[PDB]
């Protein structure tokens, strides 16, 4: 089975999907591994933190050319593995295959995209349909997304998650207490961690995004100090540079999808944390129906 996995990886590296049957097995074992994982998954450095990838398979290959190959380089992904229906299948299937092959070598968190809600509507479900004929593969991945850990903690100091902070969570134990094994709710603590944004007006604000909360620097500083944290690292927001500091370096945003949706022109970035938790940022470029609105 270890060598079947190597075969699947080799294949996905050539952008060639696995069979419906194979996806099913992959997801079965992935559930089994991720069950043992915590809502606040303990990660030990050196790791490379990665933000949104958005089903952009080729730019993920680019990511690996920058940071290095798995399992040699340890990676921590902060969600949004799927987006539009072009190469989202290969992108997610690869990252899952890596996790199944190498439990200790990568961590894959849940993003707001890893949900039945968004996947049905953005493209992933359509891709599964065009590439498999049925949509069982959409079901095998969305059932799996329920098992992704929500947050991660690098050496008890650097806190990682897709979105941001919640008015319903003060401590890491609050996150640990949650039942994460479900479809992302529209309301409450779990939603917020996947949907919230850092913000330039102190305190809490109603999220213009539809779900979650905008949160200010005063909240970041409070949250970090109470949990003994030095940094909150998160994704979720497109940043033209790939990465961005805000809230006086209490928060960093890491967006890992270059030229998002093939039109934005943004850079991507990953954050390398060395053997002693020294940060360095690496920026990269991309790799080289009614028609009536009146």
């Amino acid at each position: 089975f270890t060598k079947e996995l190597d075969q699947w990886i080799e294949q996905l590296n050539e952008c060639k999907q696995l069979s419906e049957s194979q996806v099913k097995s992959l997801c079965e074992k992935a559930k089994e591994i991720l069950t043992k994982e915590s809502n606040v998954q303990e990660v030990r450095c050196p790791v490379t933190v990665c933000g949104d990838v958005h089903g952009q398979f080729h730019d993920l290959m680019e990511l690996f050319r920058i940071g290095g190959k798995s399992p040699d380089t340890n990676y921590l992904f902060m969600g949004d593995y799927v987006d539009r229906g072009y190469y989202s299948v290969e992108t997610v299937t690869l990252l899952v295959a890596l996790k199944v092959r190498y439990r200790e070598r990568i961590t894959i968190l849940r993003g707001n995209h890893e949900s039945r809600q968004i996947t049905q509507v953005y493209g992933f479900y359509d891709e599964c349909l065009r590439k498999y004929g049925n949509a069982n593969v959409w079901k095998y991945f969305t059932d799996l997304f329920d098992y992704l850990p929500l947050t991660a903690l690098v050496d008890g100091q650097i806190f990682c998650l897709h979105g941001g902070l919640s008015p319903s969570i003060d401590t890491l134990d609050h996150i640990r207490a949650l039942d994460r094994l479900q479809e992302v709710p529209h309301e409450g603590p779990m939603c917020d961690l996947l949907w919230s944004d850092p913000d330039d007006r102190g305190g809490w604000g109603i999220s213009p995004r539809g779900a979650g909360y905008t949160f200010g620097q005063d909240i970041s500083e409070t949250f970090n100090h109470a949990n003994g944290l030095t940094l909150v690292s998160r994704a979720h927001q497109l940043v033209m540079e790939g990465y961005n500091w805000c809230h006086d370096r209490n928060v960093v945003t890491i967006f890992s999808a270059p030229n998002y949706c093939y039109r934005c022109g943004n850079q991507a970035a990953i954050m390398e944390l060395d053997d002693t938790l020294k940060y360095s940022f690496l920026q990269f470029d991309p790799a080289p129906t009614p028609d009536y609105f009146l």
């Binding site: 050196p46 050319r65 920058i66 940071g67 040699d72 380089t73 200790e104 060395d274 053997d275 002693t276």
Partner: protein, 228 residues
């Protein structure tokens, strides 16, 4: 035939990445045009800066061109300008550069000889073994993987193997399983006396590692080396 250098240069420093990259894969023919003193100052300076161009693909285009260039300059003018360029790529921020730079040393040893390598190259490669960053510590092991192929039995055993075997006790698991992956690769290039009393005991220890991966690759190495 003395003016197209101005044209070639203009494009090598242009804004658009596309002109830069393709005109680079054009330097070989222009070197053979008339390049004894011309490459020295009329063209090498432009190559030197392109070695640290911010666009990693352009650094790749130089790295891959290096062996053909280092050829036409010769051994005696390599330790001069280009040795530092070659070494500094090993420690580049982009893995694909470090990786290309690794396989670049091999092509260099292919031209200049295993003796030249034992003097110039191998020590600077042994340095990265103590590097605080594990991404670099592993580059050492990737170089030893590449160098073992063209250095032969005696030189690999003497000046490379001890460094590999000493890395079996690295605090980072990613380094430890690259040790087991290295011995699998280099093992065939070692007499049977070295594999049994020097190598095998170390691989035996690694199978008892705390990490899932280090175990697996220590086992597979023993299998592939008929040791089992």
């Amino acid at each position: 035939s003395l003016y197209p250098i101005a044209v070639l240069i203009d494009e090598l420093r242009n804004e658009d990445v596309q002109l830069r990259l393709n005109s680079i894969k054009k330097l070989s023919t222009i070197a053979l045009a008339l390049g004894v003193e011309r490459l020295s100052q009329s063209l090498l300076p432009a190559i030197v800066e392109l070695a640290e161009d911010a666009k990693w693909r352009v650094r790749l285009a130089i790295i891959e061109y290096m062996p053909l260039l280092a050829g036409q300059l010769g051994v005696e003018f390599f330790d001069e300008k280009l040795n530092s360029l070659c070494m500094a790529w090993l420690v580049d921020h982009v893995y694909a550069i470090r990786e290309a730079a690794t396989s670049n040393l091999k092509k260099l040893v292919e031209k200049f000889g295993k003796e030249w390598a034992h003097a110039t190259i191998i020590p600077k490669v042994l340095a990265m073994s103590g590097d605080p960053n594990y991404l670099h510590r592993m580059t050492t092991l990737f170089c030893i993987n590449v160098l073992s192929e063209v250095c032969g039995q005696d030189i690999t055993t003497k000046h490379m193997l001890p460094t590999v075997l000493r890395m079996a006790g690295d605090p980072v698991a990613n380094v430890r399983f690259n040790v087991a992956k290295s011995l699998q690769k280099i093992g065939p290039i070692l007499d049977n006396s070295t594999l049994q009393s020097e190598v095998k005991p170390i691989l035996e220890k690694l199978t008892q590692d705390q990490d899932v991966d280090v175990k697996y690759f220590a086992q597979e190495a023993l299998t592939v080396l008929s040791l089992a």
